[PDB]
Design an enzyme around this catalytic site. Structure first.
Site, PDB file in Angstrom:
ATOM      1  CD  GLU B  60      -2.664   1.590   2.291  1.00  0.00           C
ATOM      2  OE1 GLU B  60      -1.949   1.897   3.266  1.00  0.00           O
ATOM      3  OE2 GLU B  60      -3.906   1.672   2.310  1.00  0.00           O
ATOM      4  CD1 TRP B  82      -6.103   0.823  -0.663  1.00  0.00           C
ATOM      5  CD2 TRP B  82      -7.530   2.533  -0.800  1.00  0.00           C
ATOM      6  NE1 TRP B  82      -5.620   1.829   0.136  1.00  0.00           N
ATOM      7  CE2 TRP B  82      -6.475   2.893   0.073  1.00  0.00           C
ATOM      8  CE3 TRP B  82      -8.555   3.458  -1.042  1.00  0.00           C
ATOM      9  CZ2 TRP B  82      -6.415   4.132   0.704  1.00  0.00           C
ATOM     10  CZ3 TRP B  82      -8.492   4.702  -0.404  1.00  0.00           C
ATOM     11  CH2 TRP B  82      -7.428   5.020   0.456  1.00  0.00           C
ATOM     12  CE1 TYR B 146      -4.684  10.125   2.946  1.00  0.00           C
ATOM     13  CE2 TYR B 146      -5.303   7.839   2.560  1.00  0.00           C
ATOM     14  CZ  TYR B 146      -5.399   8.993   3.314  1.00  0.00           C
ATOM     15  OH  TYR B 146      -6.185   8.982   4.451  1.00  0.00           O
ATOM     16  NE  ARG B 178      11.226  28.040  12.390  1.00  0.00           N
ATOM     17  CZ  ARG B 178      11.175  29.348  12.207  1.00  0.00           C
ATOM     18  NH1 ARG B 178      10.048  29.911  11.766  1.00  0.00           N
ATOM     19  NH2 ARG B 178      12.260  30.079  12.419  1.00  0.00           N
ATOM     20  CB  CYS B 198      -8.187   8.760   7.600  1.00  0.00           C
ATOM     21  SG  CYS B 198      -9.771   7.969   7.552  1.00  0.00           S
ATOM     22  NE  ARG B 218     -11.106  12.983   7.703  1.00  0.00           N
ATOM     23  CZ  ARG B 218     -12.181  12.197   7.681  1.00  0.00           C
ATOM     24  NH1 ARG B 218     -13.067  12.248   8.661  1.00  0.00           N
ATOM     25  NH2 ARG B 218     -12.374  11.376   6.666  1.00  0.00           N
ATOM     26  CB  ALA B 220      -8.050   7.437  14.561  1.00  0.00           C
ATOM     27  CG  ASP B 221     -11.571   1.411  13.435  1.00  0.00           C
ATOM     28  OD1 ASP B 221     -11.291   0.643  14.377  1.00  0.00           O
ATOM     29  OD2 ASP B 221     -12.615   1.324  12.753  1.00  0.00           O
ATOM     30  CG  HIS B 259     -13.822   6.283  16.300  1.00  0.00           C
ATOM     31  ND1 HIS B 259     -13.142   7.128  15.452  1.00  0.00           N
ATOM     32  CD2 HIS B 259     -14.461   5.390  15.507  1.00  0.00           C
ATOM     33  CE1 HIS B 259     -13.374   6.777  14.200  1.00  0.00           C
ATOM     34  NE2 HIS B 259     -14.171   5.722  14.203  1.00  0.00           N
ATOM     35  CG  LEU B 260     -12.787   0.863  21.457  1.00  0.00           C
ATOM     36  CD1 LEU B 260     -13.090  -0.151  20.373  1.00  0.00           C
ATOM     37  CD2 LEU B 260     -11.337   0.774  21.898  1.00  0.00           C
TER      38      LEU B 260
HETATM   39  N1  LIG Z   1      -6.639   2.738   8.192  1.00  0.00           N
HETATM   40  C1  LIG Z   1      -7.800   3.254   8.602  1.00  0.00           C
HETATM   41  C2  LIG Z   1      -9.007   3.098   7.816  1.00  0.00           C
HETATM   42  C3  LIG Z   1     -10.152   3.720   8.304  1.00  0.00           C
HETATM   43  N2  LIG Z   1     -10.154   4.412   9.446  1.00  0.00           N
HETATM   44  C4  LIG Z   1     -11.541   4.833   9.791  1.00  0.00           C
HETATM   45  C5  LIG Z   1     -11.777   5.862  10.901  1.00  0.00           C
HETATM   46  C6  LIG Z   1     -13.256   6.170  10.735  1.00  0.00           C
HETATM   47  O1  LIG Z   1     -13.956   4.968  11.224  1.00  0.00           O
HETATM   48  C7  LIG Z   1     -13.470   6.386   9.221  1.00  0.00           C
HETATM   49  C8  LIG Z   1     -13.005   7.777   8.770  1.00  0.00           C
HETATM   50  O2  LIG Z   1     -13.820   8.904   9.199  1.00  0.00           O
HETATM   51  P1  LIG Z   1     -15.130   9.338   8.422  1.00  0.00           P
HETATM   52  O3  LIG Z   1     -16.166   8.342   8.634  1.00  0.00           O
HETATM   53  O4  LIG Z   1     -15.609  10.569   9.051  1.00  0.00           O
HETATM   54  O5  LIG Z   1     -14.781   9.508   7.023  1.00  0.00           O
HETATM   55  O6  LIG Z   1     -12.408   5.435   8.707  1.00  0.00           O
HETATM   56  C9  LIG Z   1      -8.981   4.583  10.243  1.00  0.00           C
HETATM   57  O7  LIG Z   1      -8.862   5.195  11.307  1.00  0.00           O
HETATM   58  N3  LIG Z   1      -7.821   3.976   9.758  1.00  0.00           N
HETATM   59  N1  LIG Z   2       1.111  35.169  15.669  1.00  0.00           N
HETATM   60  C1  LIG Z   2       2.268  34.658  15.241  1.00  0.00           C
HETATM   61  C2  LIG Z   2       3.052  35.330  14.225  1.00  0.00           C
HETATM   62  C3  LIG Z   2       4.214  34.688  13.809  1.00  0.00           C
HETATM   63  N2  LIG Z   2       4.606  33.520  14.327  1.00  0.00           N
HETATM   64  C4  LIG Z   2       5.951  33.150  13.804  1.00  0.00           C
HETATM   65  C5  LIG Z   2       6.501  31.738  14.030  1.00  0.00           C
HETATM   66  C6  LIG Z   2       7.731  31.733  13.139  1.00  0.00           C
HETATM   67  O1  LIG Z   2       8.708  32.598  13.828  1.00  0.00           O
HETATM   68  C7  LIG Z   2       7.274  32.337  11.793  1.00  0.00           C
HETATM   69  C8  LIG Z   2       6.504  31.319  10.942  1.00  0.00           C
HETATM   70  O2  LIG Z   2       7.284  30.235  10.363  1.00  0.00           O
HETATM   71  P1  LIG Z   2       8.095  30.411   9.014  1.00  0.00           P
HETATM   72  O3  LIG Z   2       9.237  31.278   9.250  1.00  0.00           O
HETATM   73  O4  LIG Z   2       8.642  29.096   8.673  1.00  0.00           O
HETATM   74  O5  LIG Z   2       7.183  30.929   8.011  1.00  0.00           O
HETATM   75  O6  LIG Z   2       6.215  33.284  12.320  1.00  0.00           O
HETATM   76  C9  LIG Z   2       3.855  32.834  15.329  1.00  0.00           C
HETATM   77  O7  LIG Z   2       4.114  31.760  15.877  1.00  0.00           O
HETATM   78  N3  LIG Z   2       2.679  33.460  15.746  1.00  0.00           N
END
Ligand SMILES: Nc1ccn([C@H]2C[C@H](O)[C@@H](COP(=O)(O)O)O2)c(=O)n1
Ligand SMILES: Nc1ccn([C@H]2C[C@H](O)[C@@H](COP(=O)(O)O)O2)c(=O)n1
Lengths: 316, 316
Positions: B60, B82, B146, B178, B198, B218, B220-221, B259-260
């Site tokens: 995968e 898939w 992906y 960064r 996900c 965001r 998670a299973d 989640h579980l």
């Molecule tokens: N490798 C995987 C495959 C699936 N999910 C799961 C998490 C949720 O059960 C759903 C994703 O969220 P949603 O239903 O809001 O799309 O897929 C996960 O965590 N990891």
């Molecule tokens: N309210 C703010 C304004 C600026 N930054 C800062 C963090 C880093 O110093 C730079 C953002 O990263 P980069 O330099 O990689 O763009 O801005 C922050 O944390 N919060």
């Protein structure tokens, strides 16, 4: 105490923050991957250990929600946070006809007289943005900044998408949705823009009738930035909660590269010797509800008894 | 032990996981905002407390790196993860002329004989994808998955962007950046696609000559998904490290809605009574270096002595 997570994060990068060099040529102490949880039901997380200007936060946030990308609004509320970018733009513009101004951030900080020419030239620009409608539209428009990214994401088919407006209707109809995400990270603009967004993406989560929000912040200025960063997203959290007739849960702050500029070690250390106080209480206007049409007067902060502010050099 | 963070996360949603209803109509126990740190220098984080199929992960992941969006490759390696989506697509296609097949996931799980018609119809489809070049191109192409999102993000100006390929060159030239972020979250497609990604976005961080990666997930299973999710990004972390002549730091896993599913409580509880073992050791091919041209044989797992696998119902 409520802000303790913040003091505990500053503390830690002092202990384990390895030295990391960076873009802004001022050394940093850095850590990667961190998370803070704030219970917004205990109080509004505006640091009491050092006066932080709510006014700047409030105007700026509203500016975002309005879908605005123009500096004019901010100046119109004495908010000069974003000036530097709109200035940088005009200064490069061929229409600009004045002093060298190159690297003005570095150059002003290291030259008392240059910083004089700079501030006079700036005041000029800000007034011109405020008065010249055409000038404003031309140099007062940042374009790709949160307000646009949140409320008008340009598609490949020309159209615009109001992420934030759609996420709130999605929460009104599907609280239990695990896809209430809003992103400011566009792979297509990211390599050309000057400052790729710091607050990459945030997510909402509703449970038990309380709304919480998680924010992913790729880069972070621990001393000068986080203090604000916090109240900006904790305020957004109430604002959405108010709109959705919801309660308030936690503000969870996840960081990528959290850092402390070397030129702020003494400042952070002094603040660290301060003892927190009870948190200020946020009061939103009961009658008004559609947050996008909100104005300064609708959000009231209470019982904010901060310590004296702590001045420090910026990193540029 | 190395996997302990995982066992500690499963443990916790059993204690504080409030009941959350959801899309897949099977109840869940949920928490919002969590983070795990894995030191990839202690060993490869493939759970020893229950046999997890590396083969599925390896094929995968490679599929992703190749920039592939076609099911064919996976079937070609016995990887059926898939299938369900490519099947769902053909089944809706007017060219499809067979049994009702609606809600097949729910319907098969609740009907021994329907599940029979289903599996026969599926084997058919998978072979047709494998043999009919035209069929493959038509139904074996998931499109927005992906591999495309990472390696070919369509712009508004038609062109494509190889995020991942650009992020690796950015790390080769600017480790201390960064902004080594890669996103799978497109606001423009997100509301139309069946399964919004996900693993929303991941970020790289290089310090002390060691490369670490943070992943934002965001949803998670916990029982059936995280075990894999982990080894997929911990493997990516070595793969990029190998490519960049870098060391290996930590894999930091940040969650939004962890989640579980209620139909997995007994399973998680039994695994929880298991005692971890020393971690397997990952061995990448020394000679070969440009990871995009990698194949199964170049990544070797060692000393994986797992406990017996634990079967459980899925959520649909
Ligand atoms: N490798 C995987 C495959 C699936 N999910 C799961 C998490 C949720 O059960 C759903 C994703 O969220 P949603 O239903 O809001 O799309 O897929 C996960 O965590 N990891
Ligand atoms: N309210 C703010 C304004 C600026 N930054 C800062 C963090 C880093 O110093 C730079 C953002 O990263 P980069 O330099 O990689 O763009 O801005 C922050 O944390 N919060």
């Amino acid at each position: 105490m409520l802000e303790q997570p913040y003091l505990d994060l500053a503390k830690k990068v002092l202990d384990e923050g390895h030295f990391k060099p960076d873009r802004t040529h001022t050394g940093t102490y850095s850590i990667f991957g961190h998370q803070m949880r704030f219970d917004l039901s205990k109080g509004f997380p505006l640091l009491t250990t050092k006066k932080v200007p709510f006014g700047l936060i409030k105007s700026e946030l509203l500016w975002f929600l309005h879908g605005d990308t123009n500096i004019r609004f901010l100046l119109q509320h004495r908010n000069h946070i974003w000036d530097e970018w709109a200035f940088e733009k005009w200064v490069k513009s061929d229409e600009y006809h004045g002093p060298d101004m190159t690297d003005f951030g570095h150059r002003s900080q290291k030259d008392p007289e240059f910083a004089a020419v700079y501030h006079e030239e700036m005041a000029k620009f800000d007034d011109r943005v405020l008065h010249d409608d055409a000038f404003a539209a031309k140099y007062g428009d940042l374009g790709l900044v949160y307000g646009s990214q949140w409320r008008a994401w340009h598609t490949s088919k020309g159209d615009t998408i109001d992420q934030l407006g759609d996420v709130i209707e999605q929460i009104k109809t599907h609280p239990y949705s695990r896809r209430l995400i809003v992103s400011a990270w566009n792979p297509e603009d990211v390599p050309t823009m000057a400052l790729p967004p710091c607050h990459t993406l945030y997510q909402f989560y509703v449970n038990d009738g309380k709304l919480s929000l998680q924010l992913y912040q790729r880069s972070a200025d621990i001393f000068l930035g986080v203090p604000f960063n916090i109240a900006s997203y904790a305020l957004l959290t109430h604002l959405v909660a108010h709109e959705c007739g919801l309660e308030v849960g936690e503000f969870i702050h996840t960081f990528g590269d959290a850092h402390l500029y070397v030129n702020h070690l003494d400042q952070i250390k002094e603040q660290l010797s301060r003892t927190p106080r009870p948190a200020p209480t946020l009061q939103l206007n009961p009658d008004k509800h559609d947050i996008f049409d909100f104005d300064m007067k609708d959000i009231k902060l209470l019982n904010y008894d901060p310590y004296p502010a702590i001045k420090a050099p910026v990193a540029v």
